[PDB]
Every structure is written in C-alpha cells, then in structure tokens.
Design a protein around this ligand. Structure first.
Ligand code: GIO
Length: 497
C-alpha cells in the first residue's frame, strides 16, 4: 500500500535552456508548462537532466548554460510541487553522452571518486547544487563505473547519503527527506561491471532505477524487442555476462544463478537484482521507454522480428536518409532510428503502411511496414499493464521512464501507469501474465524456503541428500560425504529457513 514511485525524466538540452520559451514548439518542444497539474499529480519524481562533473571534479551545469535561464526552468519545475506535495524534483548527473567509457567527461567521473578528498569534494558539490537550485534529491547516472572504480563509486554514494541525511535534518524535511538514486544497468552486460557489489551500491540509495530498455538496438545483428518483459524462445538469446563477475562462487553456484545463453528481458534484470543478498525489491525501480527503436532492411515472416537488418549503429546518425516514413520528429532530430510514442501514435493513425502487432510472450507491441521493410519495437498503455502488475506482484519500488517529452500531448502513458497503480476502478486481477520465458536463476538473495532434517555431525551422506544447518538447507553434489555444510565443499546451499 506504499505508493509506487513514478519517476519521469525531464530532459532539456542546453540550447533549449538558453532559449527557453513555452510558446514556440520549434524551439522548446516540451516546455515545463506541458506538465499540467494533472501530470504533476501522477508523478512522484521528475529527474531534471542532465548535469555533469567538470574537470574540477565537482557537480556542475554545462559551461555554456545561461544560469538565470536554468534557475527559471528549474523554478518552473519545483513550482509544480504546489499541485502534489509528494512530488520531488531530482537532478540527474551524467547520462550516456557525458559518462560512457568513450564519453566527453568520462575522466571526471573516474577521478571524482578516486580518493576521500575528491569524494568529499564531489559529494559536497552535489549537495550544494541541490540546495542552491532548489532540487529535492541527487540522481547519478554514470553509465557505468567499472570493477576497479566501484569501491570509489560506492564510497562516494555513502558520502552523499551522509550529507543528505544531515541536510534533511537541518532543513526539517523529515516528511520529504532528500533522496539519492542512480540509473542502473538494465542488461547483464553492463550490469556485470558492478554486479558483485550491488548490495553496497544499493545500500545508500532510496531507489535504483534500472534502465530495462534499449535491450535491442541497431548495434545488434538481429532485430528484437528492446524491452520484452518476458522471453520469447523464438527470439535471440545472449551470453550471461554475470557468470563472469568476480563473485568468487563455485561452478554450481554460478551456473544455477546464471543460465546461459538466456533471454535479455526486463524480468531477467529484475530477477538478477533480487538474486543478490541485501538488495530489497522495494528499492528496485523498473525503467520503461516512452519511445521506440526503428530498424530498416528487415524481411517478412515474423512481422519484422528477429530479422537481419541494415540499420547503422553509429552515433550521430551516419546518414541524411530519414527512412522512418511518417516520422516528422525524426527529421527534426536527424535520426530515423528513434521515435517518441507520441510520433509513433500519429504514424499509426496516419495510413503510412504500418501494422501494429503484439507479441504475447514478451507482452510488448511492435510495428511492421511490409512495403518498406521496417520494424519498430516500443511500449504502450497495453504493455504497461503487464509491467505494472509485475511491479506490484514483485513488490518493486515503482516505475521510471525516459522521458516526459515523448508521451503524447494528453500524457496517456503517464496516466496509464498512474491508473494501474492507483485507480480504485482498475482491476488487473484477471490480467494474464502469459507463458513468456521467466528468468529462473537462483542466488543467495532468492533461495526458496525449504525443510530438511538437521545435519548430524559424524553422519555420512549419499549424493543428492538434503539437510538443514546454520539456517539453510543443503544438498550434496556427490557421494560419501563425511563433513558439515560450509566446511565441506561437497554441499550446495539450495534453500533457506
Ligand atoms: O543517458 C540517458 N540516455 C537515455 C536514457 O534512457 N536515460 C536514463 C537515464 C540516463 C538517460
């Protein structure tokens, strides 16, 4: 009965800030005024983005930003709290552009967390920025820290948590404490960079917003749903990077927690987080996209799914050929590979040759243009039903999405999410979650409850035997076992209590 978080990103490029206006779409497509009172009430958090970490290793705005303008935009955002007292205006630091391994400011992130001094300096700048511009929390989107930088990242977060908590007291914000969150990897590959230390990373956070989308892209040889909730056996599968993380577990432990290959879905990412001890479901937030990814050069037979394609994976778009027919915004953004739900909705009702299909295993829609060989994977009010029920059933913290300017003018995707969680007249008790493939891995954090005869010191056990000891149920991996679980590596912990 705790309200589910609804975290929407508000992204505005510097040039739009420096020329902000709420009366001319050509310049500021999505002004703050578009976030009507109705919308502000369906949100719990708005992640204003993005800020960066400069060469000075402190949190800061983009140099070219006109400060007076920024503050005004921000103040328009915080002003929305007048409509919803639980609304928090967070500010996000990073994003793919600034922080990816090959990003412009990548070094600043690496160095910012290098030592206690840099950390305290960084942390202190985060809180200073928060207080100065009037934000309600700090969101850090480093995509992503690598194994050796993790301890620093972790220490930085703890530092930020300390300062924020102190600030909540100083500001008498007990009823709406300052918060700390991060955008987390939503796919095993990037997740494997810090997966072994999830517990420590999540400890200082109110939420970890999983970017459970972009699970398919033009950088992938076979077209696929970018945010399948569940797996489709007919779809591609992937190498389970997590089994290569520095977990220090045994072959048996790794194999049971990380089947491979596997289906790269939203369910897999959530379950992968829940497999680790100390990672509470309530802190896990499911990210969903308000845009679709388009591919060209697909062949028929499966409605464009799981087909080879001829889409360029480079960034920026290495071409001037805007082939996503009907997509006007794609021209405005010089990229036919991404389209907002808003634009997609228009394309569908526009007789452009697109046919909306539904994959009942993944529980997600897609578009197929038989004439031109196009495929678009995206989410909508229908896929969100399943994702919302999954969030409630799995007792997750809520939902996050990128980004507000991609919802249609009526704000339907946001309203759908709010409805599924809060409408007294909405009933999904009979909504069928389907037979799509579930992630079946088992780890220390999601061991099933079992019962077994207590271990008897000095007893010899055959292979496959089960016993209880030190709070867990154990099974032998082979025969003639003469020692106790934990002291004899012939036992596999398979249950709890
Ligand atoms: O960098 C981004 N790229 C698109 C996206 O989905 N985001 C989630 C937060 C980071 C941001």
């Amino acid at each position: 009965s705790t309200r589910k978080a609804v975290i929407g990103y508000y992204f505005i490029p510097t040039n739009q800030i420096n020329n902000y206006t709420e009366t001319d779409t050509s310049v500021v497509p999505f002004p703050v005024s578009n976030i009507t009172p109705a919308k502000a009430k369906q949100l719990t958090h708005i992640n204003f983005s993005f800020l960066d970490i400069n060469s000075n290793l402190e949190c800061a705005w983009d140099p070219a930003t006109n400060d007076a303008k920024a503050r005004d935009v921000v103040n328009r955002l915080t002003a929305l709290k007048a409509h919803n007292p639980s609304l928090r205006i967070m500010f996000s630091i990073g994003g793919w552009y600034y922080s990816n391994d090959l990003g412009v400011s990548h070094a600043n992130y690496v160095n910012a967390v290098k030592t206690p001094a840099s950390r305290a300096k960084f942390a202190q700048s985060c809180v200073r920025i928060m207080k100065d511009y009037g934000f309600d929390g700090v969101d850090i989107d480093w995509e992503y820290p690598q194994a050796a930088e993790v301890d620093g990242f972790i220490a930085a977060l703890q530092e930020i948590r300390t300062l924020l908590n102190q600030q909540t007291i100083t500001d008498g914000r007990q009823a709406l404490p300052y918060q700390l969150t991060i955008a987390g990897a939503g796919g095993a590959f990037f997740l494997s960079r810090y997966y072994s230390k999830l517990a420590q990373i999540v400890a200082p956070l109110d939420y970890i917003n999983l970017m459970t989308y972009d699970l398919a892209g033009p950088w992938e040889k076979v077209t696929n749903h970018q945010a399948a909730l569940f797996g489709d056996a007919a779809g591609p599968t992937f190498y389970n990077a997590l089994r290569e993380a520095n977990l220090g577990w045994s072959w048996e432990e790794l194999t049971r927690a990380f089947p491979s290959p596997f289906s790269l879905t939203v369910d897999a990412a959530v379950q992968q987080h829940l497999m680790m001890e100390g990672v509470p479901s309530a802190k896990i937030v499911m990210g969903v996209p308000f845009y679709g990814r388009a591919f060209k050069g697909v062949s028929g037979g499966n409605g464009g799914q799981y087909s080879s394609h001829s889409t360029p994976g480079e960034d920026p778009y290495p071409s001037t050929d805007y082939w996503l027919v009907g997509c006007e915004e794609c021209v405005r953004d010089k990229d036919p590979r991404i389209a907002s739900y808003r634009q997609l909705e228009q394309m569908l009702q526009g007789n452009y040759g697109y046919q909306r299909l539904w994959n009942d295993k993944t529980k997600t829609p897609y578009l197929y243009h038989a004439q031109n060989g196009l495929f678009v994977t995206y989410d909508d009010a229908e896929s969100f039903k399943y994702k919302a029920k999954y969030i409630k059933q799995q007792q997750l913290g809520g939902v996050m999405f990128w980004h507000l300017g991609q919802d249609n003018r009526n704000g339907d995707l946001l309203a759908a999410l709010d409805r599924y969680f809060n409408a007294a007249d909405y009933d999904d008790s009979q909504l069928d979650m389907g037979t799509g493939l579930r992630y079946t891995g088992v780890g220390p954090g999601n061991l099933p409850i079992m019962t077994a005869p207590a271990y008897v010191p000095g007893t010899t056990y055959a292979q496959g035997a089960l016993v209880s000891y030190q709070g867990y149920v154990w099974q032998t991996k082979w025969g003639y076992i003469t020692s106790a679980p934990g002291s004899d590596s012939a036992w596999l912990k398979v249950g709890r209590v």
